């Protein structure tokens, strides 16, 4: 209930953004004139948390000075902020077990892997997780995800296919769907021995991955001695449900609206325009919170700050965003 712990980890997609990222992390990159550290931080400020735990396996010196220039080292933030330095190529999960060997984390706590952006409430996620507590003592976690309804196959890097229960929404199995432009590897496999006590169960694709899971502190200790797991869902959510451990129930969660996580520039292409449009209701841009901005809204999605020198005869089309210190010229578009 109380003492909402969390764990924030960047630095897993340095492979993805290699022409960039040589001087600054992926999480430091500006989505709409401002980076995406604080997109998560204000979202777990909405969660009502008490402490965070950063992971900086690379570029560690230029993280905390930005936090020193943030509002988060100043004592009215929802959480005190802590960092953990690390050397390079320290993958997910092995960041957990060494932290589990430290063992600060107590009770329930928040996994945020990648870098996320959403509009989902913290409320209805959590009593649903407590409904799993009141329905199971051998529970694991509840994985909240959205529903990319009209678009399959444009979740760019990896397509993720999920099978889960009708009633309890217990995730039955995970198998990674191949590349959809590759018409060759056309087979999935789900072993029906573990399909005993469900008998009506839903197998989906469009649950767009955002890695936003919260769980108790027992399941990293379960994850501890199973040291041969290296990912979050590529290996561990399979092996915890593929009959090897006996009687362990992980749930997922589906929402009817926006939650997303950056994978490539193509994800950075889409959700930047979705955030610039009103698809990120209510978390909108003219709130102006982070570097306490001066954006004023105009119709057809115009995001202008002050000190904006707009020249004559330059048409500004739909879905644009302009900061200060800027000067457009004549005849531009």
């Amino acid at each position: 209930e109380d003492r909402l712990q969390a764990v924030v980890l960047t630095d897993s997609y340095e492979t993805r953004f290699m022409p960039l990222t040589a001087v600054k992390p992926r999480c430091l990159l500006p989505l709409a004139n401002v980076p995406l550290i604080e997109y998560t931080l204000e979202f777990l400020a909405k969660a009502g948390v008490h402490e965070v735990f950063l992971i900086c396996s690379s570029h560690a010196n230029q993280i905390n000075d930005y936090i020193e220039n943030s509002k988060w080292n100043l004592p009215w933030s929802p959480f005190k902020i802590t960092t953990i330095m690390s050397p390079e190529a320290r993958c997910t999960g092995d960041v957990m077990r060494d932290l589990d060997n430290r063992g600060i984390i107590t009770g329930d706590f928040i996994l945020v892997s990648g870098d996320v952006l959403t509009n989902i409430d913290f409320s209805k996620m959590l009593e649903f997780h407590k409904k799993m507590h009141l329905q199971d003592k051998d529970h694991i976690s509840t994985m909240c995800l959205s529903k990319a309804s009209t678009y399959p196959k444009t979740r760019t890097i990896e397509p993720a296919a999920f099978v889960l229960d009708k009633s309890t929404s217990r995730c039955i199995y995970y198998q990674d769907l191949p590349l959809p432009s590759s018409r060759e590897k056309t087979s999935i496999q789900i072993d029906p021995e573990l399909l005993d006590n469900v008998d009506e169960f839903v197998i989906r694709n469009d649950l767009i991955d955002c890695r936003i899971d919260i769980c108790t502190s027992h399941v990293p200790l379960i994850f501890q001695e199973n040291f041969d797991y290296q990912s979050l869902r590529t290996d561990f959510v399979k092996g915890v449900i593929s009959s090897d451990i006996l009687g362990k129930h992980i749930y997922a969660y589906l929402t009817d609206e926006y939650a997303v996580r950056v994978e490539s520039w193509q994800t950075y292409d889409t959700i930047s325009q979705d955030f610039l449009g009103r698809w990120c209701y209510p978390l909108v841009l003219d709130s102006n919170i982070q570097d306490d901005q001066t954006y004023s809204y105009e119709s057809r999605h115009i995001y202008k700050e002050k000190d904006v020198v707009l020249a004559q005869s330059c048409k500004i089309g739909k879905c644009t965003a302009i900061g200060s210190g800027t000067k457009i010229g004549e005849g531009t578009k």
Binding site: E298, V309, L310, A311, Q312
Partner: protein, 305 residues
Amino acid sequence: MSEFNITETYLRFLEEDTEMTMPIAAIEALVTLLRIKTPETAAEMINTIKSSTEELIKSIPNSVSLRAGCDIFMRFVLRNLHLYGDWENCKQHLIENGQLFVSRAKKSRNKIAEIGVDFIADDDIILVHGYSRAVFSLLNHAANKFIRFRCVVTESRPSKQGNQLYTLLEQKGIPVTLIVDSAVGAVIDKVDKVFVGAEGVAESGGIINLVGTYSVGVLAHNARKPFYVVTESHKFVRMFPLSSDDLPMAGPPLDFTRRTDDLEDALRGPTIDYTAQEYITALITDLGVLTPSAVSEELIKMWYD
């Protein structure tokens, strides 16, 4: 030894600078009237200006912006003689106020440019009509802010002033067209905002400036655009019609006398129109932005007694 009436004080400094305008030039002449000619008695001081203002109306009968200046100077020296100083200090207590308006009413227009900023917004095509110089100082602040807009200048016929305003702000660097006043009705749909300026404000809110500000005002109400008007806090006169007929220049607006030899025939109609409260929607003072009903009450708050 001056007499302050016609040109021995007044028309000297009207050739000094065309930055001072007509009513405060009369205010500049009226404050220096009693300054030098201070006849050490409260009685004939006001009887001096009652002689002097009524010949000043008699001097130029058709510049009734001066009459607003002739109006409020009496309203100045009345309450300035109030605070009850028995005329002992009130000789000095008036002239220590004294040079107020040559320090304050001269900075009417920049204070208009302080608070008239957020009317001309991003990409507003602006309809102006007549040299009301507070508009240009608002437009001077608009160019100095580098805010984005355009401009449209009408005629000012027969008073010619629209030809000046095109030359006045093209050198300032604004995209602008001069349009004829005849082509307002076919162009006003593209026009969004419209700025004019009165020579004086009547009791319901009056536009007593030029020939066809009421014509462009009644166009804008059917175009349903915010018909703004720019003036300042010393441009108020009691003179108030019931129709759009003020005092004319010399004769009725429908003359039918003939041309003797070569007399001017465009100059047969009026040169001053009137607009009531119905067609304006907002105005600017040194006090602030002002609704057309508050301009009635402040013109009556110290005017009934």
